[PDB]
Design an enzyme around this catalytic site. Sequence first.
Site, short mmCIF file in Angstrom:
data_model
loop_
_atom_site.label_atom_id
_atom_site.label_comp_id
_atom_site.label_asym_id
_atom_site.label_seq_id
_atom_site.Cartn_x
_atom_site.Cartn_y
_atom_site.Cartn_z
N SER C 9 0.83 -1.20 0.00
CA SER C 9 0.00 0.00 0.00
C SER C 9 0.87 1.25 0.00
CB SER C 9 -0.93 0.01 1.21
OG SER C 9 -1.73 1.17 1.23
N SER C 10 2.03 1.15 0.63
CA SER C 10 2.98 2.25 0.70
C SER C 10 4.41 1.72 0.67
CB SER C 10 2.75 3.08 1.96
OG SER C 10 2.82 2.28 3.12
#
Lengths: 126, 122, 126, 118
Positions: C9-10
């Site tokens: 996600s990151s």
Amino acid sequence: MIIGYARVSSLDQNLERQLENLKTFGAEKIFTEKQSGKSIENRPILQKALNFVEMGDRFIVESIDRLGRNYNEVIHTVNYLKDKEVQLMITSLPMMNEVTGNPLLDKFMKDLIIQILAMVSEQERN
Amino acid sequence: MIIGYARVSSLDQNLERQLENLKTFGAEKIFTEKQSGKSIENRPILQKALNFVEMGDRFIVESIDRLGRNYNEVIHTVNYLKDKEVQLMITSLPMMNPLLDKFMKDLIIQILAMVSEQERNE
Amino acid sequence: MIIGYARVSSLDQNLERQLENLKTFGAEKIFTEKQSGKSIENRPILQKALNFVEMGDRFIVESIDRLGRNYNEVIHTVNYLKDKEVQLMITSLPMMNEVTGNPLLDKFMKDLIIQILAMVSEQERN
Amino acid sequence: MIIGYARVSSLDQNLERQLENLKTFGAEKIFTEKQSGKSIENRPILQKALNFVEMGDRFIVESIDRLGRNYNEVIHTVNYLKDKEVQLMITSLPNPLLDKFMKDLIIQILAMVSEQER
């Protein structure tokens, strides 16, 4: 040492198989009994067997239903051995003891498995 | 009779919330402590609570994580109260065919006990 | 064939920590994606991996939370591999096929643990 | 719209009382079939019932064993209803995240037990 416990509600069941299946997994001394697996309170042979094994020994059953058809008493007994540092082992399920995945998850896995079998035992006597 | 227990690792966590949560469900004598729930040797306060209960009583906690993060110790603590016929209940997850229901109640507590340990590990 | 899949996600997360894992276990064709793991509907690369796999193939990942952080969606993704008959195998969780020694109890035990992990995946999200 | 489903291996078993149980909880349209729950391949009346239900509807039975005695197939059916968004109720057995997981597990246990009997 390696202790085994057999049980039969009647001679309708094959006990020679059961006893032979125990000796297959290294059953050294076997405690045989004849009674319904409805309770341990009326089973002195099991009480003697549970009292025989000490820290280090192993307890062999052909199945949880042979140990007892009672969720409350079975799980109570399984905890007794667990606390007495005696490995419970089941011949029908010769993989439950092996798993080397994760110590924590392996404890949880075994618990659920025994709990599930303990349930089916008491659910099946109906 | 009711007997509650609370615990916090530090004074940064909302201790008051837990106390009120236990008071809500009718906690009479609450046993509080400040210690990491990694072992039971550090917490004689729990031992004093387990010796406090009798039969028909009820030991309560905000959650299993507050009770302890050790799977082997927690399940042992549950079995302690089980054999004494002491009603165990969880504030966050209050669960008030018996066979299937008892099996389910146990299974969930086992999961909560496990997850409690896995949180510390990571 | 063995197909892999990674997701982050990151970049806060060590992406390389996830890449090198799949490649270790004989992954021939690996996919990679950068999307929020709250929904599978907005994750096309995942779906492309699910559309590429076929019967007899093997699908591998790092963990359940990398297949999504939503219980219903993950369970839906697993059953999609059941019906499409693709064996799912996590690398993080070192569980082996045949947990105990009985297909039914193994079937139940497999599904139960996956469902537990999916819950943990959504519990961390929330 | 609530739909039901009853099944028996033979008329020897109590079928009417099962239908009474269904219509009690609100079984409007009911599909009845005479076959073992060993497989869904030999149960076309169950095929009709599953294709009839749709988003918003409801599928109900006396128990999971009536739905089938094969863990693989039974779990597929429930997921099929989860795909069609059709809540599956059980007559014998009437925190959201937990409730979902808790329900699915109950089904899987009952589904398992149902196969073990066959």
